[PDB]
Design a protein around this ligand. Structure first.
Ligand SMILES: CCCCCCCCCCCCC/C=C/[C@H](O)[C@H](N)CO
Ligand SMILES: CCCCCCCCCCCCC/C=C/[C@H](O)[C@H](N)CO
Lengths: 297, 245, 242, 58, 49, 242, 49, 99, 58, 48
């Protein structure tokens, strides 16, 4: 039991989060109210102190004579579902016959949705995002031709054996999930849960995963979060022999049940690499367009 | 009533007569880890006054040709006082912070600094300039400590992201004709309830001049910027030998 | 054999179709979610955030790209002279591209509501001055002088302890919503101009510097909405990523 | 009716209305979210608030 | 196989088949084989007026 | 002709899809089930079972493969010397591979909860001794001496009538769940080390043997769970079965 | 696997068929309609002109 | 030596805190562990050769010819279940043909 | 409603919730099992139990 | 850096031209005698 007064009157162990703000409903845009003229002293709503770090609480009712406007413009299309529940390209797998890419008939793809700029810049608006997903696989020939071929889409989680071939033993999918499809069918579409050991994925990780000295050898590890390495996507031509059709598998991901935290500045520079916020330092481009002078247009 | 402030935590006390206000980050004050959010079962140590107190790191000089500086948290306190021993002796760490930046100048001085908190401030590099080399930053750039590091390209924050949208995070301004202190209170921000203090840095602290310092020949040309910061609601768990990195 | 007829719209993948898909992992409960601070629920929480408006978007070299975040104000002859002028169009390629409003508007096709531009004076405590910040609604060409500009919506800003004024650019439009403007018939959706004029002068004592800078900060108001989500146009990627 | 509550949003005070044909809740439709907002969390994150008409630096 | 992308005003138009606009991360799209029934989508009233 | 539209996800065989299939034998009632003992309802009933941990996993020849189930403890100089050291990682390729926990964890991707290692002394009744069994949480390198190891979680075990102690390796982790570790960035999911040090000595009288062996037995605790079922990696098959 | 039989009239596009199609823009509320004069509700309003 | 397992908990070996666990044991059940389709058989129907050159093939049902599903069932000695078999037919090259 | 109770689990006190479109119960979905456990059947299978704090060899 | 680890005040000059550093009672003995160079440095109070 607690006897001394500094321990009885202590705020240690206050687990309850003390919040200043509260979320209120805003199904529509705020309505404008009627305003008249103001000719007094002391009350000066146009003057702010931006050094506070807050934003201006000035409205148009206090800057001009306004009318009543009953707004019925909905804020429903700015939600995170409506902004992210839109399938976009996150992956592309090529299965050729001759060449170097994948000449054996199988292809493993380390899952990362940071290889296509248009979906990456949408997620990197936040640093933490938690969601369930819906992946869709659009398979076709280079020319776009639909051909009579069977494939197997195996999810290889981390730790499970990756297939070293088409005739491999990992393809028996006794415990790993798999999808068999013909190219003549609609694209395969499966729903995936939130599968992180953490409470949210994170597109930016300011740190190293491992302890120890950090020399130039193990500097690749900077930024790598194992909580986002969700495993491997594998694909093959179901068969003991060589296929006759070249193939491409394109992967489209749609988020659902989205939560996000901590918005960030948006990428203005061209991406260069996967899971690396590097940029071209010689060819730094300004965020927008330029002028000849500041007094013109 | 709002330009004066006294910040007392521990055995430490800051006065300011020319303040703006206090920024409480994301409208959350720092707190302790609840039993629902917790997963580790060891009892954490909660040293109230020996680690939750104001620490003063160093002093950067605001010159005309300045570009900016960043500091990474909690790397700034991993070699300092009792905090940087509990953090080395333990494996897990949880804390908020109160950052407080000081820059004094006269009434005949002009300039502005953006003082901002950027979570998970991952550091990119110029990639050889051409963008072909997949270069990486060394350890003395991602965890630079209390000395901080000088921004090479502060327009993109050395991460390809514009400085102009950085007010979407926490921030204050130090406008020398209005204020000389900038006080931000940051909670613990991570996907996990605890994490390592030596491997992972939760956020960065940017100090960038948007408006450049100017004065006429005769005034005090040394305008220092001093970083002063206090942990809040600190918690440590998982005790073993002291390792530094 | 419950008889059915398959209708058109069959065996197509529409990316914005929200339906039930097959789950891969049965009896998978995810990791619980701890309380993380900074939870976003609507992007209009961020359009109401003040971010820096790059009015002086003249320099391009890397040596002088931080100069785009503040524009100068100096001593003049007292003739009501012009400091700066820019468009009040967020989606148009100009100063607003630097803002979080001007980048989240790329992902939406139609916007409505009032804006908010906050200018902060970053000069000496001893420097004084008065400025006229005029919003010129559409039709109005670029005003050649201050007399033509005070006929519009305007604010006269006196420098002082409060180093910041807010010009509210209000919703003065024919359409309930407004799309993105550009040179052509989509100038129908132009919002107007914003100009800054010297009212009296920038008066400074001896010993203080003869020049200062003003940092503009632009956001949106509580009546602001966006509509018809799309893909952004004013940022593009050179191919061959990684 | 009886279903695994194993979606990514189970554990929040926001009320959804989804459609599902499976026993896993994460396979369901995304649905309509609640239209609640908290702009002051980013736009007015100050300890001691100020009103509009007042001069804040007091 | 084809791809029917709706490009609203302001969004980038594709300058080619290998273009970056086709990733349909935010624009709506429909993928169909010619062997399927014709694609059929419903559209709302999308005017600012 | 009830009109329908077939959505994508059509005519695919997803192996983890649980639906209704067509029955081949109508009006087939199976053989009744008698009460058989040993009914399993959850694999966590078996993860809580103590199985032998192959600490001394040095020998490989068939002549000496039973030596892997017990490790020696002998007379020392009384300097706090080291007997054995091993990782507390079940999924990592090491001593825990011999356990039922370390084989049913191959079929799961993420684990959480506390472990349990039980060491039994298999010496003489007259032999005495005291040992320090230290669990070193992550970050901590291999302790070079006993002084560096007692700073961690530890048990001092005195041999006696009760020939067995239990070191509980408790859940001390940043993540709620923990995946399988290996040399690389998945050392982020390392659990720590376990070391055994001589506290006093192995004291034995004249006539009794100067050497004994200790058999380790490893299991899991009541808070242990596994998640995200997969296929096992640390056992593989040379092809051409039968 | 709810068993069904597909009947004839399958995978045809009948132009005067009124059914449900898939929407491209979820959570799209249109612009409100103001009172415009001259609203037609039936063409027999105009045959009487 | 009793042959039981240790009933020792971490509350008795260290000073512990309260942890309110919400980690589910639902994925360790025998349904969730075995209700996952895996290869149990493979039948080849060639034209020339020795395997089955006539156009028919009989397969004595035993699921013990593939190691990845066999090692899952041989964790137990007695198992009672209803099943769901699925037959994926194709050419050696994986080509779907009109047969 | 009326259906052949001819699944492999009919005849146990564990309650399932399956979906079926046929008259045979074994064609149904697998469903959710009951989350009951008996670790002492393998981990503490002793005639005379012992408590934690006590020394068992008494 | 070695001094901010103690009890300290940061004083900003302004209108209020005066700060007060309170040197608080941090002592082993309830009372404290006068110190000097020798074994009565046991009663030293510290530095400022
Ligand atoms: C046939 C089954 C296929 C199912 C495959 C689904 C894979 C599930 C992964 C979804 C989660 C992706 C999250 C990715 C995060 C980022 O890529 C990482 N932070 C890497 O930068
Ligand atoms: C078109 C109808 C095809 C239906 C064929 C289904 C066959 C039913 C058999 C399922 C039960 C398999 C149990 C096998 C057990 C082991 O193989 C034996 N102990 C042999 O080692």
């Amino acid at each position: 039991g607690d006897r001394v007064a500094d321990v009885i009157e202590s705020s240690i162990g206050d687990s309850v989060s003390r919040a200043l703000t509260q979320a209120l409903p805003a199904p529509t845009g705020q309505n404008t109210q009627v305003s008249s003229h103001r000719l007094d002293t002391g009350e000066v709503p146009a003057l702010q102190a931006a050094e506070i770090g807050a934003s201006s609480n000035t409205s148009d009712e206090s800057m001009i004579e306004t009318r009543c406007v009953l707004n019925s413009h909905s804020t429903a299309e700015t939600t995170l579902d409506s902004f992210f529940s839109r399938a976009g390209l996150v992956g592309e797998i090529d299965l050729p016959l001759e060449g170097t890419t994948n000449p054996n008939g199988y292809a493993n793809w380390d899952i990362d949705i940071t290889g296509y700029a248009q979906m990456r810049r949408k997620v990197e608006l936040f640093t933490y995002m938690r969601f369930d997903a819906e992946f869709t696989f659009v398979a076709c020939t280079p020319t776009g031709q639909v051909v009579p071929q069977l494939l197997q889409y195996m999810f290889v989680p981390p730790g499970a054996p990756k297939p070293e071939s088409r005739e491999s033993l990992a393809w028996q999918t006794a415990t790993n999930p798999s999808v068999f499809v013909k190219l003549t069918d609609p694209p395969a579409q499966v729903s995936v849960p939130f599968m992180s050991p953490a409470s949210a994925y994170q597109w930016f990780y300011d740190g190293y995963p491992t302890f120890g000295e950090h020399k130039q050898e193990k500097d690749l590890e900077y930024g790598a979060c194992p909580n986002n390495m969700m495993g491997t996507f594998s694909v093959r031509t179901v068969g003991s022999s060589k296929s006759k059709y070249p193939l491409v598998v394109r992967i489209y991901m749609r988020m659902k049940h989205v939560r996000a935290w901590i918005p960030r500045p948006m990428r203005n520079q061209n991406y260069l690499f996967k899971a690396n916020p590097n940029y071209a330092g010689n060819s730094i481009k300004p965020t927008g367009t330029s002028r000849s002078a500041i007094t013109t247009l | 009533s709002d330009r004066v402030a006294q910040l007392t935590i521990g055995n430490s006390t800051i006065t300011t007569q020319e303040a703006a206000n206090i920024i409480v980050g994301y409208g959350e004050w720092p707190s302790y880890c609840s039993d629902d959010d917790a997963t580790a079962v060891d009892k954490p140590t909660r040293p109230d006054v020996s680690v939750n107190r104001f620490y003063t790191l160093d002093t950067k000089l605001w010159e005309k040709s300045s570009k900016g500086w960043y500091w990474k948290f909690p790397d700034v306190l991993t070699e300092t006082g009792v905090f940087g021993q509990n953090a080395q002796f333990h494996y897990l760490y949880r804390s908020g912070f109160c950052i407080h930046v000081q820059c004094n100048a006269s009434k005949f001085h002009q300039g502005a600094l953006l003082v901002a908190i950027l979570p998970e401030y991952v550091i990119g590099t110029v990639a050889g300039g051409t963008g072909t080399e997949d270069s990486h930053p060394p350890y003395k750039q991602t965890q630079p400590g209390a000395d901080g590091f000088e921004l090479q390209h502060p327009y993109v924050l050395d991460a390809g992201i514009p400085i102009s949208q950085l007010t979407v995070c926490h921030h204050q301004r130090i406008n020398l004709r209005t204020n000389n202190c900038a006080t931000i209170i940051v909670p613990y921000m991570n996907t996990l309830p605890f994490d390592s203090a030596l491997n992972h840095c939760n956020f960065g602290l940017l100090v960038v001049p948007i408006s450049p310092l100017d004065f006429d020949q005769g005034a005090t040309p040394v305008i220092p910027i001093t970083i002063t910061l206090a942990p809040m609601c600190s918690e440590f768990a998982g005790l073993r030998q002291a390792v530094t990195q | 054999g419950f008889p059915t007829e398959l209708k058109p719209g069959t065996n197509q993948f529409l990316t914005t179709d929200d339906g039930v898909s097959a789950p891969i992992l049965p009896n998978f409960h995810p990791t619980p979610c701890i309380h993380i601070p900074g939870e976003v629920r609507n992007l209009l929480e961020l359009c109401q955030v003040e971010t820096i408006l790059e009015v002086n978007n003249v320099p391009t070299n890397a040596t002088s790209l931080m100069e785009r975040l503040r524009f100068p104000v100096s001593a003049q002859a007292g003739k009501g002279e012009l400091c700066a002028v820019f468009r009040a169009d967020p989606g148009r390629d100009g100063p607003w591209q630097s803002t979080m409003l001007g980048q989240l508007c790329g992902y939406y096709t139609q916007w409505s509501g009032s804006l908010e531009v906050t200018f902060m004076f970053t000069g000496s405590f001893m420097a004084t001055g008065k400025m006229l910040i005029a919003y010129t609604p559409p039709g109005g060409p670029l005003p050649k002088d201050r007399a033509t500009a005070m006929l519009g919506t305007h604010v006269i800003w006196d420098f002082g302890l409060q180093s910041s004024v807010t010009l509210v650019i209000p919703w003065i439009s024919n359409t309930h919503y407004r799309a993105h403007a550009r040179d052509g018939v989509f100038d129908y959706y132009t919002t107007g101009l914003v100009s800054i004029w010297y009212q009296t002068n920038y008066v400074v004592p001896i010993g203080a510097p003869n020049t200062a800078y003003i940092i503009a900060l632009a956001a949106a108001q509580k009546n602001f909405t966006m509509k018809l989500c799309k893909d952004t146009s004013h940022i593009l990627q050179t191919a061959s990523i990684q | 009716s009886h279903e695994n509550s194993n979606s990514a949003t189970e554990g929040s005070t926001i009320n959804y209305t989804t459609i599902n044909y499976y026993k896993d809740s994460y396979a369901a439709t995304a649905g309509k979210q609640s239209l609640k907002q908290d702009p002051d969390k980013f736009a007015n994150p100050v300890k001691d608030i100020f009103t509009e008409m007042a001069a804040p630096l007091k």
